[PDB]
Structures are given as C-alpha cells and as structure tokens.
C-alpha cells in the first residue's frame, strides 16, 4: 500500500460535478493525487489512455464487511465481491516483467489478501475500447464528443492504473506514477 496523496485540493464538484483525480500543476508538471472516498451516484470520463480501469464500492471499504471490486484490462473485466480491506489509496500497478518481456498489471497495489468470499464474474472489457475527439463514457454510454467538458454500499473510490517509470534504481523518486486523470461525479 503506497501513501500517494496530495494536499490543499479545492472541491469544484457539486450545479456542476467535475473533479480531477490527478490535478496537474504547471510547476514542474506536478501530479497531485486525490482519489477520495465519496458517498454512493454515477461518474463519467473521457478516459484518456485508459488510465481509469475501475472502481471500488461498499459500506465501509474495510474489513468485517464486503466491497465490490471492478477492474478492466485489454482482454476482459473482472468483478469480485469480497472482504478486501484494501489500500486507502489503491491503484492498479503496471510494471515491466523481464522474463515474459512485457508489461503486466497487479492487483496487489489495490489490496493485499482477501478474506473468505464467493462472488466472481468475468466479461469482455467495457471501458477499454476508446476507438483510437475525447469521446466521453458515462456510467455505460460511450458517445463521441469534442473537448467542451459538457454532458450495502455507502461509499466508493475510483481506480487508476499507474505505469511505473524506469529512470534510476537509486532513491530519486518511487517512479510509481505516470499521467493524469479525471472523472466528473454526482447524482
């Protein structure tokens, strides 16, 4: 569990529901991470480069209950409901695998181990085909659009994937994060 968070982020979402998960400041191109726990609404996003992969929702998003984990990738989407007791700031990790010589995804940056559960379902991806001009997807209606920025479960968080950089092995940065994302959320 990586403690990847920002500070002093304004709440512009309501009126209009817009919100940026990774705000980007001009200074140094700084990426500001805010993936808050919201009361449970639908969201919508342009999903640039498939950064958003999924989301998690449930009563406590903690142990002694269950939450729903929905995550998409290029070949399928998997949904599970379990006592995940997942990371406060969960992400789908993306790392380079040297033996298979490819990039691979990891859920162990979302949660550690799940306790006893039974529900699982698998289907074709519903988020990944971006047909390539922002093309907004609303929660599951995918429509063409230009850049005009226009039209028990108690709480939830979204899940972004992070494409780890490989700069230096020494401790200059974690290199864990990359890119920026947003989703507009409300009733």
């Amino acid at each position, epitope marked *: 569990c990586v403690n990847l968070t920002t500070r002093t982020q304004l709440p512009p979402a309501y009126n209009v529901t817009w919100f940026h998960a990774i705000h980007v400041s001009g200074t140094n191109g700084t990426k500001r991470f805010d993936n808050p726990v919201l009361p449970f609404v639908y969201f919508a996003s342009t999903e640039k480069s498939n950064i958003i992969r999924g989301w998690i929702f449930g009563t406590t998003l903690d142990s002694k209950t269950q939450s729903l984990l929905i995550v998409n990738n290029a070949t399928n989407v998997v949904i599970k409901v379990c006592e995940f007791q997942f990371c406060n700031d969960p992400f789908l990790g993306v790392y380079y695998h040297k033996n298979n010589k490819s990039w691979m995804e990891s859920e162990f940056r979302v949660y550690s181990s799940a306790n006893n559960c039974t529900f699982e379902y698998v289907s074709q991806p519903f988020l990944m085909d971006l047909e390539g001009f922002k093309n907004l997807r609303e929660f599951s209606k995918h429509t063409p659009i230009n850049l005009v920025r226009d039209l028990n479960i108690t709480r939830f968080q979204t899940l972004l994937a992070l494409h780890r950089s*490989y700069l*230096t092995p020494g401790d200059s940065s974690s290199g864990w994060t990359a890119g920026a994302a947003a989703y507009y959320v409300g009733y």
Partner: antibody
Amino acid sequence: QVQVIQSGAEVKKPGASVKVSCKVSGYTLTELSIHWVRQAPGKGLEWMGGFDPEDAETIYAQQFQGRVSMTEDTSTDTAYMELSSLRSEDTAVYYCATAFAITTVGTNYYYYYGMDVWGQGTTVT
Amino acid sequence: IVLTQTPLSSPVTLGQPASISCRSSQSLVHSDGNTYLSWLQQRPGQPPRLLIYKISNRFSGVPDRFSGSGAGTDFTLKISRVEAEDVGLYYCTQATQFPHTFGQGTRLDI
C-alpha cells in the same frame, strides 16, 4: 529505491559451493536485472555474469565457463548464485548488483544496462 | 572488451581538481546509441557505489563535482574539487558488449 540485501560470510573446503542470496525491496526481482561480481586483492573487480533483457536470459562471463549457476526465487524476491568450481583461491567478496531491466521514455522502454545498486557483499570461500 | 587505465596513483590535494580516465579496446556503439558505460567509487568497508549512471548522467547523492564526459571511447571522470571523504577506488565500467567488465581501479591518494 532497490535496497539490495546480502547474506553473511561462509567458508567451505575446495569443491564445495556456497549459495549466496540477494534480496531486493522497492522493486521486485521481476523488474530487475541481477548481476554478480567477484572482488579480491590481486584480482580487482570481476563480472561473473547476469541478466540481459534483450535476450531476457542470464549471460555468463567468458571465464567461469561452468560450475557457476545463477537462479531466481521470484516468489520471495530473492536471487541466488553458487560456484562449485572452488579451489579456495576464489575466496572473494561476492556482490549482487542490480539495474532496471528497462528504462522509460514515454512508452518506449528500449533496454537498460547498468549495475546501479550494489548490496554490501559477502566474503565467501 | 578491455578498459585501459591512466596511472592509478591519482595524487590528491583536497580542494584541488582531479581526473582519471580509460579507453576501450572495442567499439562502444550500442544499437540505440546508448553507450552504456558508467563510473563507480569504492570507499573502504563497503561495495562500490555507482556515481555516474551513464556518461553524463549523474545520480542523486553524488555532488556536481563529478562528471563522466568523454568521446571516442575515451572517458574521463572529472572531479572539480576532491573534497574530504571523496577518497576511495574508482572504476569505469563497460556494458556495451555481451561480456561486461571493469577497469583496474584508480585510487585517489592524498
């Protein structure tokens, strides 16, 4: 931050191998190239072999032609090396050195070579 | 592939500049032009640490005093000022060929 962790010292009689571990933390072995180096007074700093991402396999030095073996316990993020070709004059400090298998420029990761993070090393016969 | 060495005595006066160098017996042209050569420093009681990750690529914790700049296989590790506790063995590396090597190791010596 790779954090390479080495085993302690060990002395064995000729022909016996000493299996030396290499534990990493911050990056899994899956992400890293592992290289091994020998060091001694009178010999200097010598590369024994290591992972080469283009072929994605371990390449051994032109010397240490055999009776040397490198493996990876990827499940525990711990790499290992042993040398059975021990004549005792091979007592040396052995080091695990690592580097990222790749570099990143946007999404083009090419291949990366280097030996950027070294563990403390161990003295073994 | 062999890395040559300048005299290993590398005499030191603190606060004064110093430099060491090596050349290659084989071409350093990497398919991507990466030229994967680098420099390390070994203080007593420890492993060598890499100072310069590439030729000109310095890593954090290593002061601006150090640079690996060079060309034509001739690479010089330049120290703008050798300061207290910069003294140990110094090596150039070679990772442009399948076999990898190290130079003999110069020693900064007060």
